[PDB]
Design a protein around this ligand. Structure first.
Ligand SMILES: [Ca+2]
Ligand SMILES: [Ca+2]
Ligand SMILES: [Ca+2]
Ligand SMILES: [Ca+2]
Ligand code: NA
Lengths: 224, 227
């Protein structure tokens, strides 16, 4: 319900705005040539340097639900995260790493999540030498066009799945949704063991048709 | 019995992380930027100094008879001109190209790219999903790693497999082998999460997620009946 702030303007943040249509987003960047393109994308543009602390206030990082940082280099990206933390220590920061070497320093400055496009892209290229099935899979489930969506579904308190093992729940046989993992806090287990027992607050990461997903949500709700 | 020849056109941070996963394989890197020479050699690859857009220097990188060719140049304009050059040489060799702008994906496929990776689109769509929690972003970046306990692997169904003509429901792959079937592919088509009655054919590739112990337990299950 709260404004997202986006620092810097790039092809990444352009595809980000396209998925945040309807939401309130501020874009703090120094390139005045991107104003009219930002506005056409349903966001607000703020002219300032994202590395300067005073210009971060104008984009109202305090009380943002999240901040996404993608600047020219990792040096300036770090400087921006350092600047953000000098204002809000708890606000969620998402940063894009250019080079793999710099991931550690970004996390250190205070990024809660680091995205590494050139590393993902390189590892999909190397796996696409014979066939493109993995690269197809990734680029499909992250799309809104796909028949199968990858979704995050929380297990609520009083859920009739509380304390049930993965084996007993039989989620795929019941709902038709494939459980590719369950996360909690900042830890995620891919392909959970058969004996893992569900807790409230666990987030189920799945793949399935919109119809399968609704059957899943009704399956993990409380009995009532 | 080993495919021995990948060609790489252009040098970027992408193609750099690509080389880290092709260690052991024979790789040629064609680029006009001379500064990356020693950086290429330390990755266990061979360097070719030339323009990837000039057809004669594409000959020198040994494009003909390559198992695949990867193109990542500065612009989408320059990437296309390189794909056209490659096609003027080998019309059947497999090409993987990196798109800068989303608008240009169609033109890249048109020129002859068999697979297009769009890094800025994948990352951009990952950022929008990482607003609340980073679980999609964690999953995508983890299954692609060598250190992770779970691997995403591609496993071909051999001729005479005991899965030939068996439905997904009857095969019971996860309950038996422990591997999660996230899809089955063939040619340039991939079905994500195949329906309960899909029947396996020889030549099908299973896209799966599992522990190495689970992966081998799977291969013995889909092996041929007559060895
Ligand atoms: Ca960027
Ligand atoms: Ca399903
Ligand atoms: Ca590039
Ligand atoms: Ca498993
Ligand atoms: Na705040």
């Amino acid at each position: 319900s709260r404004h997202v702030v986006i620092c810097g303007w790039s092809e990444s943040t352009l595809e980000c705005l396209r998925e945040l249509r309807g939401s309130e987003v501020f874009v703090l960047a120094e390139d005045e040539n991107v104003r009219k393109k930002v506005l056409r994308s349903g966001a607000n543009f703020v002219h300032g340097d994202p590395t300067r602390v005073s210009d971060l206030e104008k984009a109202n990082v305090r009380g943002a639900r999240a901040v996404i940082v993608d600047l020219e280099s990792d040096s300036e990206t770090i400087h921006c995260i350092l600047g953000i933390r000098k204002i809000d220590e708890s606000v969620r920061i998402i940063a894009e790493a250019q080079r793999y070497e710099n991931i550690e320093q970004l996390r250190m400055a205070g990024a809660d999540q680091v995205i590494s496009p050139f590393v993902i892209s390189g590892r999909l290229m190397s796996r696409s030498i014979d066939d493109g099935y993995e690269a197809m899979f990734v680029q499909d489930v992250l799309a809104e066009e796909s028949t199968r969506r990858m979704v995050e579904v929380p297990i609520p308190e009083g859920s009739k799945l509380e304390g049930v093992s993965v084996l007993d729940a039989d989620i795929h046989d019941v709902t038709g949704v494939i459980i590719i993992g369950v996360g909690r806090g900042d830890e995620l287990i891919i392909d959970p063991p058969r004996d893992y027992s569900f807790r409230a607050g666990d987030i189920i990461l799945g793949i399935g048709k919109p119809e399968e997903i609704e059957r899943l949500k009704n399956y993990i709700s409380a009995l009532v």
